[PDB]
Amino acid sequence: GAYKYLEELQRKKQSDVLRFLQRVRVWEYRQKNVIHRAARPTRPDKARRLGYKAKQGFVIYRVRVRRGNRKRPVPKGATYGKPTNQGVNELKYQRSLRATAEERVGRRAANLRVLNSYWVNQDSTYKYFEVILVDPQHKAIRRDARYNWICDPVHKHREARGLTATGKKSRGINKGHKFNNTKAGRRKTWKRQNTLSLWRYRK
């Protein structure tokens, strides 16, 4: 098929053809609204890899997010505390711009469920993502058992709870010694390690 050529070509982002396409598309996205419906995936191969299907109930949204650090919103830079917390300008927003993108997209299309998202473009000011959403009310999704899992209420706003790919990456949900702090959940692990377990017959 052609999806493999798409995948290989998309990795040559500094080639002449992809640079030209990047410039033209970034200009067009900057001309359109910050959040807007995309008629079709810009990268159909990436959409398929992330679970998109060309059927009714699958929706693509393009979203613009401001790049850079998270400036502390304190007035006049005053933090009213110890000097270790006086920092304002080098604070990093411990969540991805991709996660912010799909949260804003889900807020706009609250009737849908964020399935995934992928990077499509960026400039100095903005990072551009396309968000794959699924319509849980469409009968083509309620049937087709491969996708009706997302119709369950437990998957409401999974992007707002960090259950998408970028959300789990930012939550540090991975196996092994490098993720001891966040394997079953950071706060859950902290509660477990800071809970005093007392039995009826004290040990």
Partner: protein, 193 residues
């Protein structure tokens, strides 16, 4: 607050520790609930021993490699050597573990043997037959206990060849310590200008 001669204590109670204190008042209630759940699960499933057959497995970490214990599931190689497919074993109550590998012939043979024993000691009910009640036994683990293999005999003949086991250990340790130095010395001696 450093008083007279007492050991240095490290009681980590400087957080809001009283907000997280789990007193297991429900120990007995949870035991009763677990026994109830086991009873209802046994009644719900057909006559079936409440758990899957588990393989025999060598523990890692030489602190524990001297002992054998129940593993997760039989390897695909063990299932094939016992004459089953993995899906069929999973449907007739054999735990299958695609991750584990067989590098030990003793363990592999033991697992194939206990698989064959399990097959010869279970009765698989036909899908569309009669299959009269077969007096469900609750524990496959109790029916097929894990046995620690015997390694030697009770009594034997002394075969001292004057090897000085302590010296053997010292020499092995020294050879390991100096293998790299002697290897690089032989490399620099094989220069041959």
């Amino acid at each position: 607050a450093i008083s007279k001669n007492l050991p240095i204590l490290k009681n980590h109670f400087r957080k809001h520790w009283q907000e997280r204190v789990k007193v297991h008042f429900d120990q007995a209630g949870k035991k009763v609930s677990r026994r109830n759940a086991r009873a209802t699960r046994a009644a719900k499933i057909a006559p079936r021993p409440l758990d899957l057959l588990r393989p025999v497995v060598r523990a890692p970490t030489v602190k524990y490699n001297r002992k054998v214990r129940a593993g997760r599931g039989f390897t695909l190689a063990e299932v094939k050597a016992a004459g089953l497919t993995a899906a069929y074993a999973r449907t007739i109550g054999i735990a299958v573990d695609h991750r584990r590998q067989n590098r030990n012939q003793e363990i592999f043979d033991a697992n194939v043997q206990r698989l064959k024993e399990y097959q010869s000691k279970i009765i698989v009910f036909p899908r569309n037959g009669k299959a009269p009640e077969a007096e469900q036994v609750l524990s496959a683990a109790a029916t097929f206990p894990i046995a620690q293999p015997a390694t030697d005999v009770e009594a034997r003949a002394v075969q001292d060849n004057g090897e000085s086991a302590f010296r053997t250990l010292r020499l092995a340790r020294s050879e390991k310590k100096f293998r790299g130095i002697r290897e690089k010395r032989a490399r620099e001696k094989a220069e041959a200008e």
